[PDB]
Design an enzyme around this catalytic site. Sequence first.
Site, short mmCIF file in Angstrom:
data_model
loop_
_atom_site.label_atom_id
_atom_site.label_comp_id
_atom_site.label_asym_id
_atom_site.label_seq_id
_atom_site.Cartn_x
_atom_site.Cartn_y
_atom_site.Cartn_z
N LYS A 115 0.81 -1.22 0.00
CA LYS A 115 0.00 0.00 0.00
C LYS A 115 0.85 1.27 0.00
CE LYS A 115 -2.15 -1.19 3.69
NZ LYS A 115 -3.07 -1.57 4.79
N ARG A 125 -10.22 0.13 8.65
CA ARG A 125 -9.61 -1.14 8.99
C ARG A 125 -10.58 -2.03 9.77
NH1 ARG A 125 -4.00 -2.50 8.63
NH2 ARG A 125 -3.47 -0.29 8.29
N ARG A 134 11.96 -5.47 5.23
CA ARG A 134 11.72 -4.04 5.02
C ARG A 134 12.72 -3.18 5.78
NH1 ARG A 134 5.83 -1.34 5.74
NH2 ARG A 134 5.99 -2.21 7.86
N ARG A 148 11.04 -0.71 11.32
CA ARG A 148 9.85 -0.46 12.14
C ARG A 148 9.78 -1.46 13.28
NH1 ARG A 148 4.61 0.52 8.32
NH2 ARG A 148 3.62 -0.78 9.93
N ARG A 152 -0.19 -9.13 13.45
CA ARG A 152 -0.80 -8.18 12.52
C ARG A 152 -1.56 -8.87 11.40
NH1 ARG A 152 4.31 -4.91 10.83
NH2 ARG A 152 2.85 -4.04 9.29
N1 LIG Z 1 5.64 -6.01 -5.56
C1 LIG Z 1 6.53 -5.98 -4.40
N2 LIG Z 1 7.36 -7.00 -4.57
C2 LIG Z 1 8.34 -7.26 -3.65
N3 LIG Z 1 8.47 -6.45 -2.54
C3 LIG Z 1 7.60 -5.39 -2.37
C4 LIG Z 1 6.64 -5.16 -3.29
N4 LIG Z 1 5.90 -4.06 -2.93
C5 LIG Z 1 6.41 -3.61 -1.75
N5 LIG Z 1 7.46 -4.41 -1.41
C6 LIG Z 1 8.32 -4.37 -0.25
O1 LIG Z 1 7.48 -5.10 0.90
C7 LIG Z 1 7.58 -4.38 2.00
C8 LIG Z 1 6.22 -3.73 2.37
O2 LIG Z 1 5.87 -2.72 1.41
P1 LIG Z 1 5.05 -1.47 1.96
O3 LIG Z 1 4.48 -0.66 0.81
O4 LIG Z 1 5.93 -0.72 2.90
O5 LIG Z 1 3.85 -2.19 2.72
P2 LIG Z 1 2.44 -1.75 3.28
O6 LIG Z 1 1.36 -2.49 2.53
O7 LIG Z 1 2.24 -0.25 3.24
O8 LIG Z 1 2.59 -2.43 4.74
P3 LIG Z 1 2.45 -1.75 6.13
O9 LIG Z 1 3.11 -2.62 7.19
O10 LIG Z 1 3.02 -0.33 6.09
O11 LIG Z 1 0.87 -1.76 6.22
P4 LIG Z 1 -0.02 -1.86 7.48
O12 LIG Z 1 -1.41 -1.59 7.02
O13 LIG Z 1 0.11 -3.25 8.08
O14 LIG Z 1 0.55 -0.83 8.54
P5 LIG Z 1 0.05 0.57 8.98
O15 LIG Z 1 1.23 1.44 8.97
O16 LIG Z 1 -1.00 1.10 8.09
O17 LIG Z 1 -0.48 0.41 10.48
C9 LIG Z 1 0.49 0.07 11.52
C10 LIG Z 1 -0.29 -0.04 12.83
O18 LIG Z 1 -0.91 1.08 13.08
C11 LIG Z 1 -2.36 0.68 13.63
N6 LIG Z 1 -3.32 1.16 12.69
C12 LIG Z 1 -3.01 1.67 11.48
N7 LIG Z 1 -4.17 2.04 10.87
C13 LIG Z 1 -5.19 1.75 11.72
C14 LIG Z 1 -6.58 1.91 11.62
N8 LIG Z 1 -7.33 2.44 10.53
N9 LIG Z 1 -7.36 1.52 12.65
C15 LIG Z 1 -6.81 0.98 13.77
N10 LIG Z 1 -5.46 0.83 13.86
C16 LIG Z 1 -4.66 1.22 12.83
C17 LIG Z 1 -2.38 -0.61 13.76
O19 LIG Z 1 -1.75 -1.02 15.04
C18 LIG Z 1 -1.43 -1.05 12.63
O20 LIG Z 1 -1.01 -2.31 12.79
C19 LIG Z 1 8.64 -3.30 1.72
O21 LIG Z 1 9.89 -3.73 2.10
C20 LIG Z 1 8.53 -3.15 0.18
O22 LIG Z 1 9.79 -2.54 -0.34
MG LIG Z 2 2.29 1.31 4.85
#
Ligand SMILES: Nc1ncnc2c1ncn2[C@@H]1O[C@H](COP(=O)(O)OP(=O)(O)OP(=O)(O)OP(=O)(O)OP(=O)(O)OC[C@H]2O[C@@H](n3cnc4c(N)ncnc43)[C@H](O)[C@@H]2O)[C@@H](O)[C@H]1O
Ligand SMILES: [Mg+2]
Length: 211
Positions: free
Chosen positions: A13, A89, A128, A155, A166
């Site tokens: 994402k 979410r 990552r 992270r 997660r």
């Molecule tokens: N095609 C490809 N091929 C190979 N490699 C690739 C690739 N594409 C990307 N990659 C690589 O793969 C890796 C990942 O890519 P990357 O793009 O960084 O992944 P991402 O999908 O953005 O993963 P996140 O961990 O950032 O998403 P998340 O939703 O779990 O966390 P969030 O920050 O929103 O949330 C964190 C915490 O905040 C809380 N939180 C966040 N939002 C909410 C909400 N709405 N409600 C309640 N709690 C929330 C929760 O505790 C949550 O867990 C990288 O190394 C990348 O280079």
């Molecule tokens: Mg992200």
Amino acid sequence: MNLLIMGLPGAGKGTQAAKIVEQFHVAHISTGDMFRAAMANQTEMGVLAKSYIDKGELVPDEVTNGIVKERLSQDDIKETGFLLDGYPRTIEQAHALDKTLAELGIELEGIINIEVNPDSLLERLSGRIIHRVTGETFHKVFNPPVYKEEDYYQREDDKPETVKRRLDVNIAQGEPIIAHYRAKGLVHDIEGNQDINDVFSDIEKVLTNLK
Ligand SMILES: Nc1ncnc2c1ncn2[C@@H]1O[C@H](COP(=O)(O)OP(=O)(O)OP(=O)(O)OP(=O)(O)OP(=O)(O)OC[C@H]2O[C@@H](n3cnc4c(N)ncnc43)[C@H](O)[C@@H]2O)[C@@H](O)[C@H]1O
Ligand SMILES: [Mg+2]
């Protein structure tokens, strides 16, 4: 454009959001980013969010909705459009969002649903590394940086045991949400199991087919 982007943790994402913002100039609204910013700056919300995020758990809906609504309500979004990333979410947040959007006279134009094999996600997150200033993410195998350690970090919630929590938490909450918007004809399923540029190519075609 008014957009949501969703997918399981690690589905890309953030990576795709960065490329979307570069071309379509929408406002990137990431709840993850907002929480991590709050934490780094030791705000009250940051301290409470940490206790959940460190465990891989969802932050409570009311705090989450409030900060999103705060963002959505500001004067910018009406004319610039947004990309909501990592929210909604829970289905509760989805209902909250929908109400909020209606009040504001804003309509979702599309959901970008990145589908990735869940068996790929542990490795994506375990490899990552994150550039400090931009928060741009890289992967030590699949997308390595051009390195210098002072410029990067990992992270806290990317340690394997937190990742496993997660993934469980978000596989259960994500199905009712996607269905909710698919029912409204808004969901575009993206093949996330490709190179980063090929994933973006697919997304770009979707976005240039809207409205
Ligand atoms: N095609 C490809 N091929 C190979 N490699 C690739 C690739 N594409 C990307 N990659 C690589 O793969 C890796 C990942 O890519 P990357 O793009 O960084 O992944 P991402 O999908 O953005 O993963 P996140 O961990 O950032 O998403 P998340 O939703 O779990 O966390 P969030 O920050 O929103 O949330 C964190 C915490 O905040 C809380 N939180 C966040 N939002 C909410 C909400 N709405 N409600 C309640 N709690 C929330 C929760 O505790 C949550 O867990 C990288 O190394 C990348 O280079
Ligand atoms: Mg992200």
